[PDB]
């Protein structure tokens, strides 16, 4: 009697705070943007990138040195303006929102042609994460209030919190890809690109860093968001001056200095680059028994799948 | 012909894959799957990955020609992923539900019962009840299923029962030794 | 092909309903209400079996070739099967 009641009382008392729910990060990008290589490097692997992308799943483990806690970091990704919410909604659940972070990768090749891709994916994530905080019917939402106040008091750490330029309730880091093309851009094009790259970071309060092979900052900064996988914050100064490397600590990039909105984007868009069938009929085809059976199969299988009454 | 069977697979991937077996025990006294949970997730994802990659390597008649005639079906039926992944998550939840059931079934922490018995037990009436309740819980343990199954996975539950049975006997031994010392102590007091 | 013929048959003023009973009283296709669909499938399943037995009892080397049962309300026809038969109901009037 009292033996199990107390045992129950202890597992009830405990349960607030192997490791506690591990974090995971999702990679917004395009298809064949080089982002697969970036992810695989975050896993500290040398494997050739996979062509396809359909919520690819991979993870790894880290230790601390006093022990091996087996800190697992999960990785999810999607590329291109394909099945936006149908797939974005899959790896993201409200129960783990506080443990969820985004990183957005942009191919420098054609920022304009890539902009609707990342924008659509980003909107899908933004809308989704905003809802799941209470869509689950989380009555005891105190945690929801706490975690939101954390996110919107991490970047305006010291600077007076004048306004939340865009309430964005999930961590975000932004980075380009294949900067090898940037050195070959026209001076005028590099400048207008810099305006938007600088702006978008401070707009979301998302840090920036470069991407290369010898560049350890990529692994480091990614590691921080990935459960300190490659160290700690190690906040450095903004590199808006050199423009050769890339690095921005969110909070030091005040608009008045880095930009010096709608008008900014419109201007950069116009200057940088403005030029931004299934045949179900099967008419040139014929068959008699093959098409008759296919019609039969279609009906019978479709009705069977409905009858399964799956809750999924 | 291929697209039809392709569509069929996409709807029932959570049902028709080869079964995976896992053993459930208490590693470090903590309820855990062997192999770990994150591991079987990765295997499950790889299994569906292999299927959906099929419409890429299909040497249909006239292999000298283009192959896109087939692989186009992937994009055209990309909507199927929603159902696949939704069912995948539901299956994972079902596995967790089994996990939790056993965690609630018997608490293994087993706090040190020495303090408890001293506080408010050895009351002759309630004290005997503690023996009876333990016997009753043992009888319940004797009915624990030896295995559980979901759509594509089997779970061995005997390691769980094994650990639990040990706990049952240990609790009994504590009760018996505790009463012995309690009664003897009373006798020492009056004898003094 | 078969679906088009069934529709054409159903369009006939004589036909009052068609049921495709597959797994021994379990239908998949019907042009009738649910209570009648289930009852009719069951009845004709049992009924045809009785006729087949009757024929074998008359001669141990012959099976059913066709079975018709008529009533004032409607008339029902069934055919022998290996795996499953089909049910048609018509108004003889």
Radius of gyration of chain B, Cα only, in angstroms? 28 Å
Instruction: Output the strand order for the largest sheet of chain A.
Output: 2-3-1-4-5-6-7
SSE pattern of chain B:
HEEHHHHHEEH
Number of strands of chain A: 7
Our Rg estimate of chain A from Cα atoms comes to 24 Å
> What does the main sheet of chain A amount to?
7 strands, mixed
The helix/strand class of chain A is alpha/beta
Helical content of chain B (DSSP H or I, runs of 4+): 55-70%
Number of helices of chain B: 7
Overall geometry of chain B: rod-shaped
Report the span from N to C terminus of chain A.
41 Å
SSE string of chain A: HEHEEHEHHEHEHEHHH
Number of helices of chain A: 10
* Most extensive protein-chain contact, per-chain counts: A-B, 34 and 41 residues
DSSP helix fraction of chain A? 25-40%
Strand residue percentage of chain B = 5-15%
For the largest sheet of chain B, list the strands in their spatial order: 2-1-4-3
Overall geometric form of chain A: globular
Strand content of chain A is: 5-15%
Structural class of chain B: alpha+beta
The multimeric state of the shown protein is: part of a larger assembly
Protein name (chain B): Cytoplasmic dynein 2 heavy chain 1
Organism (chain B): Homo sapiens (Human)
Subunit structure (chain B): The cytoplasmic dynein complex 2 is probably composed by a heavy chain DYNC2H1 homodimer and a number of DYNC2LI1 light intermediate chains.
Family (chain B): Belongs to the dynein heavy chain family.
Explain the layout of strands and helices:
This is part of a larger assembly, with chains A (312 residues), B (192 residues) and C (93 residues).
Chain A: H1 2-13, E1 24-29, H2 35-42, E2 58-62, E3 71-79, H3 84-88, E4 100-107, H4 111-135, H5 142-151, E5 172-177, H6 187-204, E6 207-209, H7 217-225, E7 247-248, H8 255-258, H9 262-272, H10 289-307
Parallel strand pairs in A: 1-3, 1-4, 4-5, 5-6
Antiparallel strand pairs in A: 2-3, 6-7
Helix pairs in contact in A: 6-9
Chain B: H1 2-11, E1 20-27, E2 30-34, H2 37-52, H3 68-76, H4 80-105, H5 114-120, H6 124-141, E3 147-149, E4 153-156, H7 158-191
Parallel strand pairs in B: 1-4
Antiparallel strand pairs in B: 1-2, 3-4
Chain C: H1 2-10, E1 15-21, E2 27-30, H2 34-58, E3 67-70, E4 75-78, E5 86-90
Antiparallel strand pairs in C: 1-2, 1-5, 3-4, 4-5
PDB class: motor protein
Keywords: dynein, cilia, intraflagellar transport, complex, motor protein
Entry title: Structure of the dynein-2 complex; IFT-train bound model
């Amino acid at each position: 009697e009292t033996l199990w009641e107390i045992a129950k009382a202890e597992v009830e008392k405990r349960g607030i705070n192997a490791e506690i729910a591990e974090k995971f990060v999702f990679f917004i990008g395009s298809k064949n943007g080089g982002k697969t290589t970036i992810i695989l490097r975050c896993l500290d692997r040398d494997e050739p990138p996979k062509p396809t992308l359909a919520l690819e799943y991979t993870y790894g483990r880290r230790a601390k040195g006093h022990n091996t806690p087996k800190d697992i970091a999960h990785f999810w990704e999607l590329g291109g303006g394909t099945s936006l919410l149908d797939l974005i909604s899959i790896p993201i659940t409200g129960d783990t929102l506080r443990t969820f972070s985004l990183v957005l990768v942009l191919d420098l090749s054609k920022p304009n042609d890539l902009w609707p891709t990342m924008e659509n994916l980003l909107q899908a994530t933004k809308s989704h994460v905003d809802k799941v905080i209470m869509k689950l019917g989380k009555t005891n939402a105190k945690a929801v209030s706490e975690m939101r106040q954390k996110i919107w008091n991490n970047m305006p750490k010291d600077h007076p919190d004048h306004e939340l330029i865009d309430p964005f309730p999930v961590p975000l880091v932004i980075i380009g890809s294949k900067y090898d093309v940037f050195q070959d851009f026209e001076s005028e094009k590099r400048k207008v690109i810099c305006k938007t790259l600088r702006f978008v970071a401070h707009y979301y309060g998302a840090s920036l860093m470069f991407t290369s092979k010898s560049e350890a900052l990529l692994l480091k900064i990614r590691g921080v968001i990935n459960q300190l996988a490659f160290g700690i914050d190690k906040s450095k100064s903004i590199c808006v001056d050199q423009n050769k490397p890339l690095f921005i600590t969110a909070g030091l990039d005040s608009f008045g200095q880095i930009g010096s909105p709608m008008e900014l984007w419109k201007k950069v868009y116009e200057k940088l680059f403005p030029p931004k069938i299934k045949d179900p009929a099967r008419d040139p085809q014929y068959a008699e028994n093959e098409v008759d059976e296919m019609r039969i199969q279609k009906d019978l299988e479709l009705e069977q799948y409905k009858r399964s009454s799956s809750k999924s | 012909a291929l697209e039809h069977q392709y569509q069929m697979g996409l709807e029932a991937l959570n049902e028709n894959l080869p079964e995976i077996n896992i053993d459930l025990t208490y590693k470090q006294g903590r309820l855990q799957f062997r192999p770990p949970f994150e591991e079987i997730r990765a295997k499950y994802y790889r299994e569906m990955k292999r299927f959906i990659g099929i419409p890429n390597q299909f040497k249909g008649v006239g292999e000298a020609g283009d192959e896109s005639i087939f692989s186009i079906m992937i994009d055209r039926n990309a909507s199927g992923f929603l159902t696949i992944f939704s069912k995948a998550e539901d299956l994972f939840r079902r596995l967790s539900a089994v996990l939790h059931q056993h965690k609630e079934w018997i608490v293994i922490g087993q706090v040190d019962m020495e303090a408890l018995v001293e506080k408010h037990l050895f009351t002759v009436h309630d004290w005997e009840k503690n023996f009876k309740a333990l016997k009753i819980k043992g009888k319940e343990v004797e009915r624990l299923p030896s295995a559980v199954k979901v759509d594509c996975l089997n779970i061995n539950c005997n390691p769980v029962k094994t650990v639990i049975d040990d706990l049952i006997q240990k609790l009994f031994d504590l009760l018996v030794l505790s009463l012995k010392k309690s009664i003897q102590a009373h006798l020492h007091e009056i004898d003094t | 092909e078969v679906e088009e013929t069934l529709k054409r048959l159903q369009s006939q003023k004589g036909v009052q309903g068609i049921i495709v009973v597959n797994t021994e009283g379990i239908p998949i296709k019907s042009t009738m209400d649910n209570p009648t669909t289930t009852q009719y499938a069951s009845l004709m399943h049992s009924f045809i079996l009785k006729a087949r037995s009757t024929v074998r009892d008359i001669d141990p080397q012959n099976d059913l070739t066709f079975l018709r049962i008529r009533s004032k309300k409607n008339e029902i026809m069934v055919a022998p099967d290996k795996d499953y038969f089909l049910i048609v109901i018509q108004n003889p009037t």
